[PDB]
Structures are given as C-alpha cells and as structure tokens.
C-alpha cells in the first residue's frame, strides 16, 4: 500500500497568491499515468477527482480553480493547487485519497488561515 | 507471469480447523494486499478479510465472529488463511486475491467441504 | 457497511443484443472504488472493470461501465455465447468491501 511524507499542517495569508496542499507518495510504482486516481476530500465531498485512465479532472462549482499538476504525479506528487478566493471559505482538514491501481492510501492536512 | 498457487481441497468436521494457503509469484509480494473470498456452492462471492502483504495488518469480515486469522509469510511470499469451529456453513470454495481497492488477479480456489 | 444491490437477478438476451445491468449502492460510491467482475460455472473470478468505466488488458471493449454515487452498470453491447456468466459489482469504501449478489446472464435461443 502507498506511504506518505506527512505533513500535520499549512497555512496561508493573503499574500499567497495561490495556495497548495501537499501530498507526497513515497512508494509509488506506477509506469504511467493512467494507473493513478487521486482524490480530495474537504468535509465528506470529494473535491477534486482526478481519474488518469480517463485524463478527467471534476470540480463542483465552488472548486472550479482547483486542479493539480498531471506532469509531477508519477513521482509522487499529488498536490492540491487552488485559488485563493476558493481557499478562504473552506479551511479545515483536507483528505489526499491516492490510489494507484488496486493499491492505495490516504493522508489528513488541516489547512489554516492566518492573518497579520 | 502473476500467479497465485493455493492449496489443495480439504474435508473436514464440524467443530476443526483448516489452513489454506495462498503462495504468491511474478510480482513484489511485499508491495500488495491480500484479500480472501469464499463461495458456497451455488451462492454467490462473500468477501472474508484483508491483509497486507508488507505489515501483517487484518481486516476481517465482521460476521465471522473471530474465527478466522490471516497471516503472511515475507520470507516465502505465502498468505494462509485459517478458520476454526467449522460448521456446514462453511462449505465452499476459498480464494485468495492480490488487491485491496479491486482484486486484478486471483487463486485457483480451494474447496472445503464440512459436513460429519 | 455499503450495501450492494445487483439487478437484475437473471437475464435473458438473444446473441448479438445489448445487456444492461445494475449495481445499486446504498450509500455514496467515489468512481474508483466500484469494480466488476465475471466468472463463468467452475471458475475463479474474473476482473473486466476497474475504476468503474476502466476495463483491464484484454476485455474486450464490448464491456464498458458507467455511473457515479449510488448507480452503477455494466453494458454488454453485443451479447456473445462465451459471455454466459454471472457478473458481480464490488465495492471498497473506508475499511469495508462488499460484493453484489450477482447477474446470471442467459443466452436466448
């Protein structure tokens, strides 16, 4: 099963121009990107689904700038880009469901606001 | 070249025990899960437990009531699986199967009839 | 403790017509944890689907699945008489797995 660098906590300021969630697997073997499928999950929602046999990302509406970066995913980078505006309203645990064929696991970061 | 070799059939009474044993080949053992399915004869699947490969970590079906316990074997890439106090029930065919979100590939199968 | 409900039970197709069947879930599936399988009288299990639209290396693409939250189905466009089987959907959520009960599917003549 897939292991994770763990990360407790990040947090951002308005200075963020754009604010990422981490999620490193360590342990993966996948030759090519269709074997991989990451998820996001905010508060029993999945919010970002990224299936790599289909190259389909899904969004609701108040997640519409939320994407990761296909390129850095077979080595193990599953990490959450969003925009800030996105950000603000939805601070709390987020979930990084990866799953590498029948393979998989999960990680919880809490993303904090702060403010100066 | 992935194979998974189960044990031959067994009969036995109400009230033993059996061990039916799952040897794995053609792929990092370590680097998988394990689960167990049995099927009675004209019935359909019935999923028994979890168990991975790499730690030894169980999950099992909560209607067996603790009567089965799932072990591996690192150094012979071997996964057993052992129910006690057999009852009619019970007769069926176990199988063994590589995944843990889905199951890819699976053992031959291994019949256990119980009856006196 | 997902429960899956498979429809329907037995199916009778002519060769050369299109079988659809169910997979209801009694809660929320996510895409990839929804599965289908075959096995044919006297056979071990065979997996066709994974991700619930993604067939495996060498399944024909007759079969194709689709559906999201608590529908699932797998459709088999042109029924041929090496697809009589039983077909089962299984799932995977949060430490639970669980099978459907099943689809008999017949050939008509």
């Known amino acids: 099963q897939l292991l994770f660098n763990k990360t407790k906590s990040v947090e951002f300021t308005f200075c963020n121009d754009t604010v990422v969630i981490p999620c490193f697997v360590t342990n993966m073997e996948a030759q090519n990107t269709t074997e991989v499928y990451v998820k996001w999950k905010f508060k029993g929602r999945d919010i970002y689904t990224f299936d790599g046999a289909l190259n389909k990302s899904t969004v609701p509406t108040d997640f519409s700038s939320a994407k990761i970066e296909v390129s850095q995913l077979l080595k193990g980078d599953a990490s959450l880009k969003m925009d800030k505006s996105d950000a603000v309203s939805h601070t709390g645990n987020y979930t990084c469901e990866v799953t590498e064929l029948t393979r998989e696991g999960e990680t919880i970061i809490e993303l904090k606001y702060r403010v100066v | 070249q992935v194979q998974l070799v189960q044990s031959g059939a067994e009969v036995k009474k109400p009230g033993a025990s059996v061990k039916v044993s799952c040897k794995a080949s053609?792929?990092?053992?370590?680097?998988?899960?394990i689960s167990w399915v049995r099927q009675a004869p004209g019935q359909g699947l019935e999923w028994m437990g979890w168990?991975?490969?790499?730690?030894?970590?169980?999950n099992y079906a909560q209607k067996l009531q603790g009567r089965v316990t799932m072990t591996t074997d690192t150094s012979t890439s071997t996964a057993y699986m052992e129910l006690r106090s057999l009852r009619s029930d019970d007769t069926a065919v176990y199988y063994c199967?590589?995944?843990?979100?889905?199951?890819?590939?699976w053992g031959q199968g291994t019949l256990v009839t119980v009856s006196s | 403790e997902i429960v899956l409900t498979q429809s329907p039970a037995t199916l009778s197709l002519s060769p050369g017509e299109r079988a659809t069947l169910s997979c209801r879930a009694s809660?929320?599936?996510?895409?990839?944890?929804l599965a289908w399988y075959q096995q044919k009288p006297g056979q071990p299990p065979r997996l066709l689907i994974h991700?619930?639209?993604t067939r495996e290396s060498g399944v024909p693409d007759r079969f194709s699945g689709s559906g999201s939250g608590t529908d699932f189905t797998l459709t088999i466009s042109s029924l041929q008489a090496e697809d009589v089987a039983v077909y089962y959907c299984?799932?995977?959520?949060?430490?639970?797995?669980?099978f459907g009960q099943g689809t008999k599917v017949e050939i008509k003549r």
């Open positions: 199967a590589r995944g843990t979100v889905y199951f890819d590939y």
């Open positions: 053609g792929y990092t053992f370590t680097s998988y899960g």
């Open positions: 168990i991975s490969a790499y730690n030894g970590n169980t």
């Open positions: 809660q929320s599936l996510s895409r990839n944890h």
């Open positions: 991700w619930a639209s």
């Open positions: 299984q799932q995977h959520t949060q430490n639970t797995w669980t």
